Amino acid sequence: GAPSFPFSRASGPEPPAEFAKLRATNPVSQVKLFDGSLAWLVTKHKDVCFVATSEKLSKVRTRQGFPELSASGKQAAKAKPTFVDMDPPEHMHQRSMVEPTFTPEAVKNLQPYIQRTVDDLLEQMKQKGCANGPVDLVKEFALPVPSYIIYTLLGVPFNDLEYLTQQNAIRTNGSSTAREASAANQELLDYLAILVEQRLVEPKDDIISKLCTEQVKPGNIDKSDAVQIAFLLLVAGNATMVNMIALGVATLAQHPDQLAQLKANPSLAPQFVEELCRYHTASALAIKRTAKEDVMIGDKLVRANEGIIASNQSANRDEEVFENPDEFNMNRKWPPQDPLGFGFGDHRCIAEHLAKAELTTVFSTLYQKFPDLKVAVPLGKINYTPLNRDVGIVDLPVIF
Ligand code: HEM
């Protein structure tokens, strides 16, 4: 029978072993989801791009055969959708309401603020020190950098950042009870609703205010929609950002020649970030569709109302695109084809430029501030996310 999916990672920092075998012998195959239903799994870079762009495929989760991967996903699919789950024309109708903050030009103009945020958190880490033992690079740095930035862009005032960063972390922490995670989720929604009310009365220079002035007041969306769009922008990428920062530090510890390169030349940070986003595809479960009509993919017929999962993680290890794909090599010569860490097509991560700027700022600054930063536990004992989840690191003891 069809194997259960998601697959488990082969070890803490490695992709599932199944993908390499599937790319070689069965690149479009059926898998069994948590509820016993079947879905198609696509593993080659070319086919992942096809799935991401075909207008014969839908992200609408109320369609028959949509590949929800858990009971919580089936429950979430009942809610009113935001643009992440929309097809044209609704998708860009709503996404364009918030895209301006995320353009290359806007993200370039944000660079001094990104740098200040990273610098301030590094200085707080220095002042706290590690004189009594290792400290957790996740809690002290990888968590607040993306959290403070997206909260600030949305419109949260500075004094509220630390508490709301902690609450949003509780939401997804693997140690939280269900009650604890649900209470933190509702606290974030309650806070955002009050912020939307405030910005309807007195808008400021932030994303929520722009939604209020330009879409809520004119009746293009309502205020509960504005809350949900803001919430999507917070929760869609934050855990992935935290994991990418921590994975970057661990990857450099595992590759000491490349770390020494980066310590000696911070202008290598962009190249490092490109290879990191290919090699550790920390969001690998989001390119999902159902077929609106029959569609042929490779040697398979995907029938109408059948589900599809396109693994951008597998695509990023596709030997036919990336030479020596399972080596981390920030000095590689890149091919014509895009790495797919941020997806592809109309739904490609709205925050791709922001995320790369955050990551480039982190890795061009971290080892200037802390040239002796070391992972404090043996690398084989790093606390990775559980193997049946997206790759990530829960906590990362360091000294400096
Ligand atoms: C290194 C960090 C990140 C990675 C690797 C990442 C990756 C991804 C991927 C793989 C997708 C799916 C794209 C597709 O459907 O083809 C996506 C979509 C999305 N991401 Fe991210 N992301 C990151 C950071 C962020 C951040 C910081 C935000 C918000 C500020 C964000 C918000 C979103 C949203 C809203 C979508 C849905 C876009 C749409 O369907 O139109 N992501 N991201």
Residue numbers in the entry: 4 to 403
Provide passages from the article that reported this PDB entry.
P450nor is a heme enzyme that catalyzes the reduction of nitric oxide (NO) to nitrous oxide (N2O) in the nitrogen cycle (2NO + NADH + H+ → N2O + NAD+ + H2O). In the resting state, the enzyme has a ferric heme with a water molecule and a Cys thiolate as iron axial ligands. In the first reaction, the water molecule at the sixth coordination site is displaced by NO, forming the ferric NO complex as an initial intermediate. The ferric NO complex is then reduced with hydride (H−) from NADH, producing the second intermediate, intermediate-I (I).
TR-SFX and SF-ROX yield the same geometry, whereas the synchrotron data show different geometries depending on the X-ray dose. The X-ray-induced structural change was localized at the heme–NO moiety, and there was no appreciable difference in the protein structure (root-mean-square deviation of Cα < 0.1 Å), which suggests that the photo-reduction occurs at the heme–NO moiety.
